[PDB]
Design a protein around this ligand. Structure first.
Ligand code: BGP
Ligand code: BGP
Lengths: 474, 474
């Protein structure tokens, strides 16, 4: 017998400002690092960018009405820092705050709980220009000032907040892989920026305790649970290294305020460890979150990797199946195809049991409630005559992940809610518009902007029924 | 770039009173549960028992002289509770205390550090008769009286103490598998006795802080780190279940004072969870140890197990290779042969890398120092003419584990010491005398005590050389 989903389970869906909003230069909004980066040649799929995106800034009333029609309990969205502080630092842009206030009002007038993400990768370019953004401790005081602004303004109406969305992704992609702004490939700078981002996260959680005493806050981590390829001791050891280096490196800091020792000693042996200042540990250890936010798409299987072995690998940004290649850390671990799971056209593993495994690992290790802040299936969709989008693949993906969440709840994992990625189709940072996640199809592609009209997919109605029965019918 | 062993790394060897001492009814000693159990037909290999064992009680001066020849830094032994309290909880037998006083003085006169195990499975039979020993909360106060008696007598001279040796083994073998006293096969009774043993462990650690404020104390857990068979998600999940039910169930209590929640909920679902009294959680959470004691011999590889699958398996007690069979918990996991490791004649896996993995898991999860209180190879030995025993198989086994310990120290695991099982050959509880672990061969077998003469094996001189070079020369 499964436990039921708890009565006030937050059935949600999610978006991110740069990927949906558009209006990139309207109503006083400043330049963000993604405004600049996406316009650089070769950075994005077919030169796509978020100048217009799906124009949610102008169509939010229509979108929220589709949320209300679906019966969403919660909508997760991010605030565009550059809309609120065009220069990151100076005067507040009241037109910017007014849009999110209008959005929050619309959500609550339809009975939808807002989940606000403070940071979803769009730091104002002025801060990058002024002092290198996340590579400078000044961003701690500046990020704090921006979050306290939002706390003060909306703390009375928003109860659930996410600090940093996938710190491990925007730090790693921006400073090690060079696939995000600032486009750097420097492991030393990566760990310095990562450490500063850790301090920023802790500082705003502390500020949150003053300004929103009745609220709940936490970071959202991009969690790929690691698997060993097999029972060979050297591959299990590679799995130990991979979980500590890819996952504990962040989640131990979030939950305990401490970096894991084996990864630290390994970085220190190379001069790659971050610069710690007095007070850093006191701050990191005095900032307990209310939950661990988890963005989950797939697990990763690993095996042993020689000191001269695999480093950077090819990532599939085209939807042409089978084109990604193994990546790893020489000497520590390398990824390997898991022969027991299917994969998407972008080579992502489909592993819903992996989600239960991951929820169990976090509960068992940190004893924290979990808010699943992202999960979903990115695939091609076909619009059919009669406004029909038959996305059975997406229904079956979500169905199996929701089923494993109920098992994890039965196993004792305190899951506060589930936010599917995404409510409407939106711009994928590196994959363009063809890689669709929405319950609501948006009428545009990578060649033509068309009319951006919204069309309900088969999965919209499936998820509507899930919410109505509180998950009893999947 | 390996780190050296620390300057005062405790290079040790170990024994246990019932396996080594003999003199089972001399100098006022009372009956233990093992004196009674091993004399029951069918309970032990060929009816062997520890009436004489290897007569360490009379020959301790010879044995310590051999330890000094070897250059042992530390000797781990257990105190026979029935020597000190013949009826478990009445008047003290001073002759019993005098033996351990002579032993400790003999060790310290040769510069060897005593490591005292309070409990190595031999609770006096009078407590079993009076109230069922570990199934009664009365044992908490009776074990405390015994522990404080030793703390006050020897605390000036012994700084390293172990509370319960392998609680997971003597509780599960005595109350679930029926292979140790009291021979019970009842899962509910097992978890009750286990919870009482947790309370007794916490209580003596609390007392220790008062009576030996400068000492170090910890439990010694029988740790078999679990592996998934492959990357099939269902087998990784079986691995999560196995590591939680077999390892976290004890080590989380030792380190954090809490049972893991998924295992608790599963037991609670069948009414097998232990009876928790008010005050229990407070006691368990207020008894932090100085180290995790780790008894390591092998890893275990697991795969999924259907609800009608494998339960109890066959254990090898004869030294005939390939006679063990799979065991598991239906619905959760079953053990499976790991094709990547060798096995002994008793079907124990040989996995030195698994020790590194196990050390890393404890350090990463609990941030505790580790004292390896047991590790060694049980095998047939042949005495050759001229009193020669060439146990190159044992040297190879020990060498590879000591190498993996050094790599774990380099990873940042704080390892305090290493006690090889065992200093001399001794009685294996269920395997008789032919399953030998010693650096020192004892001339006897299952059929004759012979002259009990001590004979240094090749591994004796190998370890002497390890200690002399502080592990630089393996
Ligand atoms: O768009 P992708 O690369 O398919 O990833 C899908 C999603 O998962 C995370 O990485 C991001 O937080 C989202 O913004 C979104 O990008
Ligand atoms: O003697 P065995 O069964 O080979 O195991 C070897 C050792 O196992 C450990 O569990 C016990 O603490 C030791 O007393 C010793 O028995």
């Amino acid at each position: 017998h499964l436990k039921p989903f708890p009565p006030e389970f937050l059935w949600g869906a999610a978006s991110a400002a740069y990927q949906v909003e558009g209006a990139w230069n309207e109503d006083g909004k400043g330049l963000s690092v993604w405004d600049v980066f996406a316009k650089q040649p070769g950075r994005t799929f077919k030169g796509t960018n978020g100048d217009v995106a799906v124009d949610h800034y102008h169509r939010y009333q229509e979108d929220v009405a589709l949320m209300a029609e679906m019966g969403l309990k919660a909508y997760r969205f991010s605030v565009s820092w550059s809309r609120v502080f065009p220069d990151g630092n100076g005067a507040v842009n009241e037109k910017g705050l007014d849009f999110y206030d209008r959005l929050i009002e619309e959500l609550r007038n339809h009975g939808i709980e807002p989940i606000v993400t403070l940071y979803h990768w769009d730091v104002p370019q002025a801060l990058m220009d002024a002092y290198g953004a996340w590579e400078s401790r000044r961003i701690i005081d500046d990020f704090d000032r921006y979050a306290v602004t939002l706390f003060q303004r909306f703390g009375d109406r928003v109860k659930y907040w996410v600090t940093l969305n996938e710190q491990n992704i925007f730090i790693s992609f921006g400073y090690r892989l060079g696939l995000h702004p600032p486009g750097v490939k420097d492991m030393k700078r990566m760990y310095e920026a990562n450490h500063i981002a850790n301090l920023a996260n802790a500082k705003v959680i502390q500020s949150f305790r003053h300004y929103v005493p009745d609220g709940k806050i936490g970071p959202s981590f991009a969690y790929s649970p690691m698997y060993p390829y097999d029972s060979r001791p050297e591959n299990v050891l590679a799995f130990e290294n991979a979980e500590e280096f890819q996952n504990h490196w962040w989640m131990d800091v979030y939950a305990w305020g401490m970096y894991p020792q084996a990864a630290w000693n390994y970085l220190e042996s190379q001069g790659l460890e971050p610069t710690v200042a007095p007070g850093d540990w006191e701050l990191l250890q005095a900032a307990k979150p209310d939950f661990m936010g988890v963005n989950y798409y797939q697990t990763t299987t690993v095996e042993h990797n020689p000191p001269d072995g695999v480093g950077e690998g090819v990532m599939n940004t085209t939807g042409k199946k089978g084109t990604s290649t193994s990546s790893g850390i020489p000497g520590l671990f390398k990824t390997v195809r898991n022969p027991h799971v299917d994969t998407t056209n972008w080579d992502w593993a489909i592993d819903p049991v992996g989600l239960r495994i991951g929820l169990r690992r976090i509960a068992n290790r940190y004893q924290l409630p979990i808010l699943i802040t992202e999960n979903g299936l990115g695939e091609f969709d076909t619009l059919e005559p009669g406004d029909i989008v038959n996305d059975d693949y997406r229904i079956d993906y979500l169905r199996r992940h929701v089923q494993e969440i109920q098992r994890a709840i039965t196993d004792g994992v305190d899951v506060l809610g589930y936010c599917a990625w995404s409510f409407t189709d939106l711009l994928s940072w590196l994959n363009g518009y063809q890689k669709r996640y929405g319950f609501v199809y948006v009428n545009r592609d990578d060649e033509s902007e068309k009319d951006l009209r919204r069309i309900k997919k088969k999965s919209f109605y499936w998820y509507q029924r899930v919410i109505e029965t509180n998950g009893a019918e999947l």
